[PDB]
Amino acid sequence: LSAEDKAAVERSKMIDRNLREDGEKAAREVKLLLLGAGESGKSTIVKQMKITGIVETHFTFKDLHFKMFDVGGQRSERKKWIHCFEGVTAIIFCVALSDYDLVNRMHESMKLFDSICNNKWFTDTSIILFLNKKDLFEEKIKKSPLTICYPEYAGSNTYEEAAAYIQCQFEDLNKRKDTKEIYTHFTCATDTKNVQFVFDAVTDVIIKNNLKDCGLF
């Protein structure tokens, strides 16, 4: 009975301890999943923050560690591997705002957003909608009316109303408004507040998760 098997059991205990330690260490990083249409702004986004199938991007801010996976180079049935990613802390959806005229493209991006938002696996995951290229939207709205992309729209052909209308168009595609929250932001080149916005949204999500775990819903 257990002559030198004791050495085997000791080895088992040691590597079990190492497993537990590595798991506890990796359960304090926050994971973000970066969708987005075809090179809409996804390349631009990773520049502002500190900085083959998928590529991670580890970065830190205010003593918090973010990992951010993008899957743009994975051409396959998204249904067959999207379930790997359930349990990410948040989705970052990136939308180019100057694409309402080039080709319709906005309609396709809204279709993708609707497909991702209401998936059977992301029924609770919060998403952050980033809207890029607001600068070009200035001198693209001057000549081409937004009615080109939204024929049922009646309002001033100015930036202030157009941006709010587009944000409202996107923000009401979620069929479950009582469980998931959608954060929105108009990107700004300088004034590195983008990462600040991400930080705020992620902190609220952590608060909700802790409230769930403590038993207060």
Partner: protein, 283 residues
Amino acid sequence: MVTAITIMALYSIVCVVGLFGNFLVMYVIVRYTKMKTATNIYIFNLALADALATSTLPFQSVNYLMGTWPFGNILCKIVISIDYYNMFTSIFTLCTMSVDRYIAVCHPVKALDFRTPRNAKIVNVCNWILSSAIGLPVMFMATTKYRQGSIDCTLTFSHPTWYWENLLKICVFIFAFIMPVLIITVCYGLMILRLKSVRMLSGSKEKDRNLRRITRMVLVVVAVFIVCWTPIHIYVIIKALITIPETTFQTVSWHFCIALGYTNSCLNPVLYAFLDENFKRCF
């Protein structure tokens, strides 16, 4: 004897519900959930220390009826000590659950380190250790003394009585009423203020039903603790400062007030377990 009917009845009611509810809780918590997360550890220890403190009661029931301690010096020291011990180690779990909840809401980013299911195991063990600072000294000083009528359990303190008998009474007051009431109020106080400004819990008629539910659940917890623990402490101190001639009503009031103390251990499963969101989410 109308009084003897009530006094015997009141303790019996408390004891039966306490054992029934608490032993059920430990059964469900380990059969199905198996102690995966930090909170479930805490509920178990509260359930455990509530079950033990309730099982001491029947020995106090027979003592009232006979006025004699039949169980001898063997059991006297092990009954009184496990009664003072469980008072502190039940209260301190309540204080630890509150300090835990406040961290997880008001300091979300630093809570990624303090809150780990291993650290919950350290605190609970370190909680039972610190309770023994009063569990053990009463074990050694517990004694049985024969009196004019019969044998009664009592703690003979030391050579001076005026300077040491009151020390235990005053010390238990500060470290089992003032500190608990203080920290479970402030910690729950600042939680509610922060929950106002959470984008998830404000903006819709259905959202605020969630905020209403949370502030009701938190407020109930403090209310029960205050009502179920204040009367006995104030009644002990008053009896230490004035004669209180032994009237039949004084006997009626005193034993009822003691039963009110144990009501805290019976209600805990309904508040902390039967109202827990996860408990409903598995039945």
